[PDB]
Amino acid sequence: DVEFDALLGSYCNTLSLVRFLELGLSVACVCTKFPELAYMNEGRVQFEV
Amino acid sequence: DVEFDALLGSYCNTLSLVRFLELGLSVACVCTKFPELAYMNEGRVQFEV
């Protein structure tokens, strides 16, 4: 009498990653990198209306 | 006078035999053959997510 325990497979998933600009939400944001942002103190925007 | 009897027919039952690959059931399982499963003791599959 012979006996064996069989390991018959496994399946990983691809952890898919989205872009955030490959997405319809990103019309509402104007995302611009300001890479000195820590060194900023206070900023204003002008509006002549 | 003449007198007899007439066996006026006898008809058989045609048996249809299924094949199980020509079904919508086959989409649900993975038919794999493995001649040593009586020699198998336990079977394990581990998964990754």
Curated annotation (Swiss-Prot), chains A, B:
Quote the subcellular location field of this record.
Virion; Host nucleus
Membrane-crossing ranges are: none
Task: Give the UniProt family note.
Answer: Belongs to the herpesviridae major capsid protein family.
Free-text function comment from the UniProt entry: Self-assembles to form an icosahedral capsid with a T=16 symmetry, about 200 nm in diameter, and consisting of 150 hexons and 12 pentons (total of 162 capsomers). Hexons form the edges and faces of the capsid and are each composed of six MCP molecules. In contrast, one penton is found at each of the 12 vertices. Eleven of the pentons are MCP pentamers, while the last vertex is occupied by the portal complex.
- Record's subunit section: Homomultimer. Makes the hexons and eleven out of twelve pentons. Interacts with triplex proteins 1/TRX1 and 2/TRX2; adjacent capsomers are linked together in groups of three by triplexes, heterotrimeric complexes composed of one molecule of TRX1 and two molecules of TRX2. Interacts with scaffold protein; this interaction allows efficient MCP transport to the host nucleus. Interacts with capsid vertex component 2/CVC2. Interacts with the small capsomere-interacting protein/SCP.
**Name of the protein this chain belongs to:** Major capsid protein
